[PDB]
Symmetry: D2
Subunit: 493 residues, 4 copies
């Protein structure tokens, strides 16, 4: 398997410079300008993430315009993702807009609407009306970004709870609350999300990073919110709690991909468990054939330091080893002091990790999991990747309009670059979260319909030659899968 | 493997009406008429074998004409094979046309040409001029169908050998002789063979069953005897002795196929070893991707009896289990009393054997033997057959003009019929010795060169429908190797 | 698999002198004397089969005594098998003790008891009372060893059938009848069988070859007939018809082994099917870990001819290739003209077949079929045989007193001889139908109980040495099933 | 594969409270007392590491005595490891005890002994006398834990080199230097190591963590230094540079185990490559059947903070996923503020990692790698672990006196606890670096020579039974040669 593969490796060999993993960068104050964006692109960014939990529509409109320009100027295609704010539990108001909590002392959390303004350090409101229930004695209540920690001990009545302030901390008006291990029942898409999602559709974003998904039904709600004009936008579900992890199979089923939000998962789940959860969610996505993003606290110390820690480096490497399609940067690029350096370092780690990755294990493991009989395209994509291993071909050319085939082929993990030739420019952008693929845009209006596909195959091969994947004499596997089937093993000229 | 597969089988289930193995029938007096040939075709014959060790050119010309007519009227394509006589060793004549050999007696066998017509029980001739330098003391000399056996003891001169008659037997004029364990050096192709092969080329036979092949070099001699006008005729090498078995790897390499002549091999090898030899030669041909024929003493007793023995039935079944492409009938159809019945019974045994055969074992065993990296064709044909197993497709359509691809695909053993669409009618005939394939002729002169392959693919699919292999809704794997190409179609 | 193995073989390489398959010989006139028996033993016989469908109890008593003496003199252990007659259906009597049947003739068979002596060529009796109900129009009725065939077409009344004589043949009194494809649901053990089995138990036979077993219930009936004094006798079920083949799984389950009676199966099932059936029954037995015998029409022509046919030679070889534990000889040894030559030729074919057999395929195949988890015994025997393949050990020594372990180890097919050391002489005899095993008797009343198994292990290794299987320096795998496995460095 | 396995997992069900990985703790000022050691043992410490690069023989004698007593008091066996100081290339002294290096600035690095005290930013000393001959122009010279990077440009003469200061950095007296792409012929056992090793032998330490092993012959020098009275002490080679990584095959061959010193390897090797190096070295040791330790910068932030970082947690987990036998703690326990908490957290991470680990993969991989034919021992241990998988046995009992068998069985990775019964107390301590094993001491002097192994097997089973591994009706695989599958009574 892989253990056997490690025995044959050496770090003193040249690393065949091809990076399959993709990097997503969160845009912010230190990276919003066009020039800062081009630098990010030249450093290795494939997707530009807009964190909608902060910033106005005019702010994000600037990001959208600057990304599209920076990309245009450099001649590439960069995906634009809208990361949703999601549902949120905020407290009521306080008398004097403040409430000084202190260590060891008691307080009372009521489900009574009358205290929405009469809040004091002794008794205040929390807008989650199913409070006295989902909350038992011994549980914890995190308030204000998880800084303040209360410890429930009994219920005064059907609306109030008696808590102990476990640590001193001052809290102002309406600051979010978290309920560790408690099954909350908040709606998927909030009113704010609904408004932001319609904006995303109008601006033509490529994908949505849907916050706090815990149900297959919730994914459906996000679709409706996008409406018919946003039927082609991908919905990447952010798994941020235990429910999302429990219902992972059905959520993956409905979604277009998954994001493992380690930091959010870590709020109520032990760190060591989050590690294991990451392995599970990534492997399940791999088998499903949908992109998976390793998402939080990546190269964290680089947000201010020019060099990351020993541990941060291995964390990035292992996300790749786990099978992640993409790795993400949040504050490192959003408010960081070294935007380009973090991305460059991340790309470097991904390249190195790849050289050691035994992709034949993935191919084999994904083949054994296939149910027999399987459908035509399933069989075609496996055989095409099988041929790659058999002939030791140096590249694959997949003609896919919607990116469906490219994503299916990539699932089998060939040990060579995959070049996708599409007539859709959005496919070029959406494939940016799929590992080991590169898209070549074929203009049907400027170069004709190519009814016969040869021009597209030629385009894909020329790109492969251009990049140095294949030289005259090399073998290249070509495919066409759904919309209506074909595979060729070409001798590159 | 095959073990596990046997556990899931049942003799009560319906046999999937499809037979992959092919039947070769030797034509003779009982079967030369066009009406007898038609019946042989209706019974299961795919190839008509002409045994050239007997009969003239007018005799075989009749067989050739009658086979074409019988096939034409029935609307099928039947291959025509010319089985060569090969180099022969025979004694000279005797005084009184006879020579009574007696056990324990002493005689002299010589190479001296003067004793051609002067032969006696004490001293006679043998036309193999190297007899003395090849044979050693202690060796045996079989004469007259191996009935008479003498054992050489010493050299009288540089032309004569002193032998002991080990058993009583009377021999008449010019009877055949066999040299067990002897490295004969006779020319690959004799005189008559050179003449017969030039007749075969003129008449357009599809293949040659070359007798007594010993070296790869000998195959080359046959190739040349056929000349440039016969470059497309296949050469199936008949392995009839220990040398052929010893040099089997190189012989398979140059030949277009092999024939395991069990009876001939049995003249100098213990029956039980011939059985094992059969397994070896068949497996080697399977891996090579060249047709292999299990050839002698098949359904032997049915020549005169309406029913075969239990042992003959298992022998035919095991030839198929071994991996033989074809099974052959000699005297059963040539001079037999039940021509149609033997062929019918043979086909029935092959059909039954097939239902029990685990073809996935062949596929995976063949895949495991290929070297990485492999050539494009090799990789395409395996992936195509792999897809068949994956999608559980019910048929394969192979566009092959020379039959090269069809033969390569068939090597991987898909568990479904293979339909080959060719623009050559001779490919339709030659593929008759490759198991599990059926050919569909596409006339490129009367239909268009079909660049794009759409019409040919349609033709292959229609044929698969007309035979009931696939229905609307079914998957069918399509291939074209030499541009490369593979498709999994949905039937309509 | 076998394919990849065939590529590496050469018929010019020397074969080993180790034969795993076993030979069963049917004793008869030609071979009953203690002189003829010793010749059979020297030729390759491991089991002496007594066909109880003919001969008296005194006749078989002689065979039993002569076999035990012949064996005693040659210092070996030979198993004794009693082949049961099983139920049989037979016609009534005729006027003049005869009835000339002719081609075309329209006759009537009657379930009516009144015609049990009033038989004539136009109307006669058949003792199977469910005759008229079970037999339909179009079916066939075989009479007198299957020589006379008759096709039914209609019912006269509720006891008689109208038949056509399809071939001319004269039949005398009480001659057996066969009903092809018809579910003749006759009993397990007949009265005769119940008497013969009682005799077999008193005489100490090692196994029973139970005729016409159709179901798992029937095996139970045979076990009952043997009683408590015969609990250790093995019941090998002879599969001779379609029912036996259908219910094969449950029959193998309750039996101690199976016999594939090809000729009997061939009466109603087409020959080509019998071939396939043979493969199926053998593989099923292999997986089950129970001995399977390829039984009829083996080397037929060698009954009167000094040499067999090509086809007969391949049939014997393929029975071994199929996985048969034993191959059997009936008339060839019972009334044959060349008793010793047939057995010798058969052994020769088995030795040759073995040299080409890829036993790793069997091992691989049996290991794969194992469900996960498995019992301790199951796990130990596989790992022991696994170690044999790993270390290229040249012998295995199995301490088994009932032969259970030896039979389980043998199931995994090690590519080396298996030596079983037992304290029971009957185990030595019974293991004679299990392929690739040889038994060594350890006399516990004369040598001690040997706890710690030291002496027994030494005996097994000593035999392996004396047989030339292992020489100083080789590895030998030792086993006992309380579990235990060793990989002994030979001295 | 592990992929298949991950699909069946769930962080919401139980975890057999069984931990196969072992924890090594470096003893120091904040963990030297008998009371602090007992706390470390209760938290999860199996091995006590003595860093001999600082402190006198009297300081370490106290650690030795306190470890012995803390262990005795609790009733357990704890291994004692002596981590060698090893050879070192330092610089000489400077005028004013300082030397401000600046970018672009040219300086001269010499071997001349006269500048051992006259050092200046312009020209200074380096105690590696073969420096000029080992180095070449274009190479790099790292000084002060690799912070200062200089680049060789030319040879001024047979003793001096002309270098460019590639980055600004101030360096004080005698600081360590590293030579990134150069093969160094430094002596394996320095004079100080020679002395420390004989002390280790006299005090009966269980293993040596040999610093800076760059070659196979070097391991031999360490054996010669331990002498005949220390032939039973294990030599764990610390791989700290590119040569050790390059000659890893032969080093593993001669050593008794390996230690992957990530931080030391990181001085000259890019962090991302050290990660891959870690995978390679661990897999190589796994196949070899010798213990491997993931060694530096583990849960580092927890030396000051009560909680580690996200990344530190995954680093520890992945060391286990890689196949490491042991994970180590240096400053976290030596001078840390939360000695017990770090060890406890580390154990917790190892337990969790284990629950997700697919040990069948290890077993299977190793089996496809063995040669055929194999030795008896090799074949017996694999079949024994095979049986474990076959019967779903819940424990293994290995009677091993030297620990060789226990270590070979552990190599195959059974998915159940391994219980080793020994007549040697040092074997109990040495097996503390082998993952998934637990030792039971059988006192041959106060119980008998037990020829027949009856009593020892019983002891192993009672321990398994007492540990809750097996109960009546469970299968237990036990292992001159013999293997058994028992039915627990």
């Amino acid at each position: 398997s892989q253990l056997a593969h490690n025995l044959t490796l050496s770090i003193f060999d040249p690393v065949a410079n091809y990076r399959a993993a993709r990097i997503i960068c969160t845009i912010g104050p230190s990276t919003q300008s066009v020039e800062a964006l081009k630098g990010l692109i030249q450093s290795g960014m494939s997707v530009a993430r807009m964190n909608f939990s902060h910033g106005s529509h005019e702010y994000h409109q600037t990001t959208i315009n600057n990304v599209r320009q920076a990309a245009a100027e450099l001649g590439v295609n960069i995906a634009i993702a809208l990361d949703t704010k999601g549902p949120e539990i905020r407290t009521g108001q306080f008398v004097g807009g403040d409430a000084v909590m202190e260590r060891g002392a008691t307080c009372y959390v009521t489900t009574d609407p009358a205290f929405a303004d009469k809040g004091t350090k002794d008794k205040f409101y929390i807008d989650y009306q199913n409070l006295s229930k989902v909350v038992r004695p011994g549980n914890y209540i995190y308030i204000d970004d998880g800084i303040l920690i209360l410890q429930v001990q009994s219920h005064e009545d059907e609306q109030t709870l008696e808590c102990t302030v476990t640590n001193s901390h001052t809290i102002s008006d309406r600051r979010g609350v978290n309920l560790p291990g408690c099954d909350v029942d908040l709606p998927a898409v909030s009113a704010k999300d609904r408004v932001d999602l319609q904006f995303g559709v109008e601006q033509g974003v490529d994908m949505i990073f849907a916050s706090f998904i815990r149900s297959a039904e919730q994914v459906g709600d996000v679709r409706k919110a996008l409406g018919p004009k946003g039927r082609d936008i991908m919905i990447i579900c952010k798994i941020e709690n235990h429910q999302g992890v429990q219902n992972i199979d059905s959520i993956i089923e409905e979604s277009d991909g998954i994001m493992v939000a380690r930091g959010d998962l870590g709020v109520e789940i032990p760190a060591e468990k989050v590690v294991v959860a990451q392995k599970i969610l990534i492997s399940k996505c791999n088998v499903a054939g949908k992109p998976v993003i390793c998402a939080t606290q990546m190269l964290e110390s680089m947000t201010y330091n020019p060099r990351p820690t020993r541990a941060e480096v291995s964390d990035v490497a292992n996300a790749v080893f786990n099978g992640a399609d993409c790795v993400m940067l949040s504050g490192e690029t959003a408010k960081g002091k070294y935007p380009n350096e973090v991305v460059q370092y991340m790309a470097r780690i991904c390249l190195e990790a790849q050289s050691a990755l035994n992709e034949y294990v993935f191919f084999n493991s994904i083949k054994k999991l296939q149910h027999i009989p399987m459908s035509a395209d399933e069989a075609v994509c496996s055989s095409a990747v099988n041929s790659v291993y058999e002939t030791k071909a140096k590249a694959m050319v997949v003609l896919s309009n919607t990116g469906r085939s490219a994503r299916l082929v990539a699932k089998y993990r060939p040990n060579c670059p995959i070049v996708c030739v599409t007539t859709r420019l959005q496919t070029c952008r959406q494939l940016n979260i799929t590992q080991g693929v590169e898209s070549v845009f074929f203009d049907a209006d400027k170069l004709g319909h190519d009814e016969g596909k040869e021009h597209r195959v030629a385009a894909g091969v020329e790109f492969a030659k251009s990049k140095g994947y294949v030289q005259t004499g090399d073998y290249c596997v070509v495919i066409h899968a759904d919309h209506a089937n074909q595979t060729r093993i070409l001798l590159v000229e």
